Amino acid sequence: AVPKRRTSKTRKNKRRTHFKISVPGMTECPNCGEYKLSHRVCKNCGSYNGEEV
Amino acid sequence: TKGILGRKIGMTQVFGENGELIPVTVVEAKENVVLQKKTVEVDGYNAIQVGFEDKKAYKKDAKSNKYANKPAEGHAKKADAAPKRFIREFRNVDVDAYEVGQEVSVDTFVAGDVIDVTGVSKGKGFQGAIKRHGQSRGPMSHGSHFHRAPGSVGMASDASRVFKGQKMPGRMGGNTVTVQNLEVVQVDTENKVILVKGNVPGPKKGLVEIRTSIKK
Amino acid sequence: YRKLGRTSDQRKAMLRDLATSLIISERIETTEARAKEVRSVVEKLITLGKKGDLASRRNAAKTLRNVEILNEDETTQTALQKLFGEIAERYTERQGGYTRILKQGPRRGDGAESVIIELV
Amino acid sequence: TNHKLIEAVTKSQLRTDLPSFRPGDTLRVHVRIIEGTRERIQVFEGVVIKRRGGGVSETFTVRKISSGVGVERTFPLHTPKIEKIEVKRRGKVRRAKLYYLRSLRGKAARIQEI
Amino acid sequence: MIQQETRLKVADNSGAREVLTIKVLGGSGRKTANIGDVIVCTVKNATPGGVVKKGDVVKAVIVRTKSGVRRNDGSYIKFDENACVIIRDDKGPRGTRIFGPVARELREGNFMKIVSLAPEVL
RNA sequence: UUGGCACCUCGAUGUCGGCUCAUCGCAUCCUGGGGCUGUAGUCGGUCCCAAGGGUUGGGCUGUUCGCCCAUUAAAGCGGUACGCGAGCUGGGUUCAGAACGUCGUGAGACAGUUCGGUCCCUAUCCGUCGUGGGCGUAGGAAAUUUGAGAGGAGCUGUCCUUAGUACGAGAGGACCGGGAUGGACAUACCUCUGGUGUACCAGUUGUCGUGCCAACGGCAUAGCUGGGUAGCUAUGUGUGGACGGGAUAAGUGCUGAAAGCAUCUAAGCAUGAAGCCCCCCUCAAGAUGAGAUUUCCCAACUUCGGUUAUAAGAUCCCUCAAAGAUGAUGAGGUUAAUAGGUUCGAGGUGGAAGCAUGGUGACAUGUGGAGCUGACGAAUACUAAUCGAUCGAAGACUUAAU
Ligand SMILES: [Mg+2]
Ligand SMILES: [Mg+2]
Ligand SMILES: [Mg+2]
Ligand SMILES: [Mg+2]
Ligand SMILES: [Mg+2]
Ligand SMILES: [Mg+2]
Ligand SMILES: [Mg+2]
Ligand SMILES: [Mg+2]
Ligand SMILES: [Mg+2]
Ligand SMILES: [Mg+2]
Ligand SMILES: [Mg+2]
Ligand SMILES: [Mg+2]
Ligand SMILES: [Mg+2]
Ligand SMILES: [Mg+2]
Ligand SMILES: [Mg+2]
Ligand SMILES: [Mg+2]
Ligand SMILES: [Zn+2]
Structure with a gap:
């Protein structure tokens, strides 16, 4: 099976409405103040849950 | 006509008065309370709303459905009850025989009562036509390239379309199912359990609704 | 239990390797799913070590790998000996929970959630 | 255990007058035939080839050779239909399920006694 | 569980x-028969001298x-x-003796x- | 149907039969309701209403047909590109090989036969089956709901009794009514019977290892073999099509004139089908006509139109399963039993290792229903669900009544 008609610019962009990524789930590291992934070690300072890793 | 809510515990068996083996489902139906009374005057129809299985009290930073939120806590407190996990209406009962805040004990039913039991059937996820709709396979040999496919979906130019209701792969189970004319084998008031003859829909821990059988 | 994208024999082999490496090094970097599986394996091994009897040593031998650990004092001991010596002694008074997992974030090559699993 | 509620509600179904026995033991099972209004005891004697399940659900199976034809009877261990069970002989076997006897006849099928 | 083409003693x-x-x-x-059910069957093997002969189409009760x-x-x-046992229309056996246990x-x-x-x- | 015509298609509209999946008509095969009968009864014949549901396995043949075997209440007839090959097959048939009969001088040929002979395609659109997000539904929310509409279901045997009665010389043998129990189908479910059960237990071969013994590991389909938990399951276990109401069809009548009689019909009034509308089951307010009930939140600042972060609430992220392709759903996130671990069990396996004893030994016995044990039950914060962040109201106008 093959496309019977080409896809308009309009139809293509409608289809891509939901094709996107989200901002990561991130919060400020309470130790060093730099952003980190929630529930992950902070890579800037190596800290997690008030302790060094 | 009577009604109660319980959780499906699991199946077992009991020996009857003649030694016949009776398969049973154990339903734990503790902590049923009449939360609201609906009437033709206020609501347009008669029914009792029953709440089942106390959940925990409201707390500030609640993160799960274990803790009642403020709307639910107010609703239950109006009945003077603790907030409840499951809330369902029974239209088949006589509203005048119940008071808001009243307990509905398993003793409302008696052994021999014929009942209808309603639950949500077990989910099966995405399933094909053979399993979901019970269709026949194609040949497994003799050169076949048709084993579990759903088969023809229409005819030809007439009608150049697939009719609504065509049976196709999709999500299976997880549907409301009523089993009619089961029987109350036993009522154990100490344990707050009803032994129902036979099997009922849903996984273990699933919510089940027991009503007096509509057909009589 | 997870399958970890491997056949039964390959999965068993990988879990023995991971558990032995964790016993040896006391903390390893690996993927999240692998760590969540090996925590159970390792803690069952710790339980055997704490039991300490000969039957338990042989049951542990079924799982551990044959690896030599060179101690600071130029002395050597097997992973099994380390398990039934210092690790078991360490966790005598602890009832379960001999491992912890610390999520690190996706790695570059395939986006796998890198984690650290360590003893204690 | 099994679920506490299941055990609690089925506890009174359990019988306490049954002798201990194992697969490979030869049993005489006295069974109440309640045909019509007359009741009589028919004895089924044979080797226990199977015991399975738990609580009120537990069952056992006994095998006999009748007129040259093998016959297997499976009972709920706690059925009131059984008047009593007698352990006629203790067998020496090496596994829980003696399905291999189904394929054996005569001296080949004999169970050593303990 | 007896079906078409099942053979029986x-x-x-x-x-x-x-x-x-x-x-x-x-x-x-109806797909399967069990004890107490009647089947139509053909005699594939017969004893020389018997009343029922090879190739007879008969009715039998599964026993x-x-x-x-x-x-x-x-x-x-x-x-x-x-x-199974070969039967007449009145459910009586065609033979005079039955062998082996019956349900x-x-x-x-x-x-x-x-x-x-x-x-x-x- | 056999044809006639040659109007679409020869820069391709795949052709018989079968398989899978159906769907529609009714000129009805069964079952339901009726009139007539050369209808005694039991059976039938013929015609009318009726499309709700149902309407079988095999032998032969490529076959469709058809005959046959054995059933069944019945084994309906037709349309849908003689439904369905981007769903399957490819036996027939119209490519290349070969052969027979036959025709032909021959090359070759034959709606004659025979053996053999490549069935491609990752679905863009509509359509269909599932599953999410947006906005709307004049504040923001959590639950519970009405049911406009829509979908599902809808079949039938046999036996007992009435009653060996009515009927009939006899043979035979009922209606109506009351019970029991099946076939097929549908649906839920795993207590039972069984299947599977690749991180459960055990036996065992070959070979390579862990130095050796003993004990174990790797590989040989999970090496093979005997069992087997949960889950998933049918062939297993429950349940359903019950009882009824309203209006009708063919019919059957009452009263009744037109037409002093007659007349079911014109007015009027009854009765009458498995069919129609309900009763039963499921979905359902995007029902933009966006419905209803209960409960929750409710202030400051304003260029005074309005705004604001916050409230109730919900999420991100995280631990998960009864849920699941992913979203979604549901159980939980320390004021915590959500999972892992740990402890105790269930079920499974069936007698661990070590040691002792008896044997020359293979082995046997005891210690000891031992040891082990994924998913199932209970308990326990030991590990991980940290610290955090985001979103989310202030309620338009008109009229009437108050
Ligand atoms: Mg088939
Ligand atoms: Mg294939
Ligand atoms: Mg292998
Ligand atoms: Mg073209
Ligand atoms: Mg007609
Ligand atoms: Mg043949
Ligand atoms: Mg066609
Ligand atoms: Mg096609
Ligand atoms: Mg061909
Ligand atoms: Mg040729
Ligand atoms: Mg010639
Ligand atoms: Mg089962
Ligand atoms: Mg089970
Ligand atoms: Mg090797
Ligand atoms: Mg050796
Ligand atoms: Mg090799
Ligand atoms: Zn930091």
Whole structure:
């Protein structure tokens, strides 16, 4: 099976409405103040849950 | 006509008065309370709303459905009850025989009562036509390239379309199912359990609704 | 239990390797799913070590790998000996929970959630 | 255990007058035939080839050779239909399920006694 | 569980030794028969001199099955073999003797003469 | 149907039969309701209403047909590109090989036969089956709901009794009514019977290892073999099509004139089908006509139109399963039993290792229902669900009544 008609610019962009990524789930590291992934070690300072890793 | 809510515990068996083996489902139906009374005057129809299985009290930073939120806590407190996990209406009962805040004990039913039991059937996820709709396979040999496919979906130019209701792969189970004319084998008031003859829909821990059988 | 994208024999082999490496090094970097599986394996091994009897040593031998650990004092001991010596002694008074997992974030090559699993 | 509620509600179904026995033991099972209004005891004697399940659900199976034809009877261990069970002989076997006897006849099928 | 093409031993002295099932009686689309059910069958093997001959199309009642039967009390009975008895229109056996044990369900089927002739009824 | 015509398609509209999946008509095969009968009864014949449901396995043949075997209440007739090959097959048939009969001088040929002979395609659109997000539904929310509409279901045997009665010389043998129990189908479910059960237990071969013994590991389909938990399951276990109401069809009538009689019909009034509308089951307010009930939140600042972060609430992220392709759903996130671990069990396996004893030994016995044990039950914060962040109201106008 093959496309019977080409896809308009309009139809293509409608289809891509939901094709996107989200901002990561991130919060400020309470130790060093730099952003980190929630529930992950902070890579800037190596800290997690008030302790060094 | 009577009604109660319980959780499906699991199946077992009991020996009857003649030694016949009776398969049973154990339903734990503790902590049923009449939360609201609906009437033709206020609501347009008669029914009792029953709440089942106390959940925990409201707390500030609640993160799960274990803790009642403020709307639910107010609703239950109006009945003077603790907030409840499951809330369902029974239209088949006589509203005048119940008071808001009243307990509905398993003793409302008696052994021999014929009942209808309603639950949500077990989910099966995405399933094909053979399993979901019970269709026949194609040949497994003799050169076949048709084993579990759903088969023809229409005819030809007439009608150049697939009719609504065509049976196709999709999500299976997880549907409301009523089993009619089961029987109350036993009522154990100490344990707050009803032994129902036979099997009922849903996984273990699933919510089940027991009503007096509509057909009589 | 997870399958970890491997056949039964390959999965068993990988879990023995991971558990032995964790016993040896006391903390390893690996993927999240692998760590969540090996925590159970390792803690069952710790339980055997704490039991300490000969039957338990042989049951542990079924799982551990044959690896030599060179101690600071130029002395050597097997992973099994380390398990039934210092690790078991360490966790005598602890009832379960001999491992912890610390999520690190996706790695570059395939986006796998890198984690650290360590003893204690 | 099994679920506490299941055990609690089925506890009174359990019988306490049954002798201990194992697969490979030869049993005489006295069974109440309640045909019509007359009741009589028919004895089924044979080797226990199977015991399975738990609580009120537990069952056992006994095998006999009748007129040259093998016959297997499976009972709920706690059925009131059984008047009593007698352990006629203790067998020496090496596994829980003696399905291999189904394929054996005569001296080949004999169970050593303990 | 007896179906078309199932072969069965004949548990009698009618002359038929082995039958092949042609039909399970008792409704359209009925797939399987068990103890106490009647089948149409053909005699594939026969004893020289018997009343029933090879190639006869006859009716038989199933008296033993490997599948067995379940009883209202939750007990079961199963046999090592599938066996049937050739019958007349009045449910009486074509032969005069029955061999091997038979299930008690035949009584509820009203095959009283077969039950009486059986050496054992279980 | 056999044809006639040659109007679409020869820069391709795949052709018989079968398989899978159906769907529609009714000129009805069964079942339901009726009139007539050369209808005694049991059976039938013929015609009318009726499309709700149902309407079988095999032998032969490529076959469709058809004959046959055995059933069944019945084994309906037709349309849908003689429904369905981007769903399957490819036996027939119209490519290349070969052969027979036959025709032909021959090359070759034959709606004659025979053996053999490549069935491609990752679905863009509509359509269909599932599953999410947006906005709307004049504040923001949590639950519970009405049911406009829509979908599902809808079949039938046999036996007992009435009653060996009515009817009939006899043979035979009922209606109506009351019970029991099946076939097929549908649906839920795993207590039972069984299947599977690749991180459960055990036996065992070959070979390579862990130095050796003993004990174990790797590989040989999970090496093979005997069992087997949960889950998933049918052939297993429960349940359903019950009882009814309203209006009708063919019919059957009452009263009744037109037409002093007659007349079911014109007015009027009854009765009458498995069919129609309900009763039963499921979905359902995007029902933009966006419905209803209960409960929750409710202030400051304003260029005074309005705004604001916050409230109730919900999420991100995280631990998960009864849920699941992913979203979604549901159980939980320390004021915590959500999972892992740990402890105790269930079920499974069936007698661990070590040691002792008896044997020359293979082995046997005891210690000891031992040891082990994924998913199932209970308990326990030991580990991980940290610290955090985001979103989310202030309620338009008109009129009437108050
Ligand atoms: Mg098929
Ligand atoms: Mg294939
Ligand atoms: Mg292997
Ligand atoms: Mg073209
Ligand atoms: Mg008609
Ligand atoms: Mg043949
Ligand atoms: Mg066609
Ligand atoms: Mg096509
Ligand atoms: Mg061909
Ligand atoms: Mg040629
Ligand atoms: Mg010539
Ligand atoms: Mg099961
Ligand atoms: Mg089970
Ligand atoms: Mg090697
Ligand atoms: Mg050795
Ligand atoms: Mg090799
Ligand atoms: Zn930091």
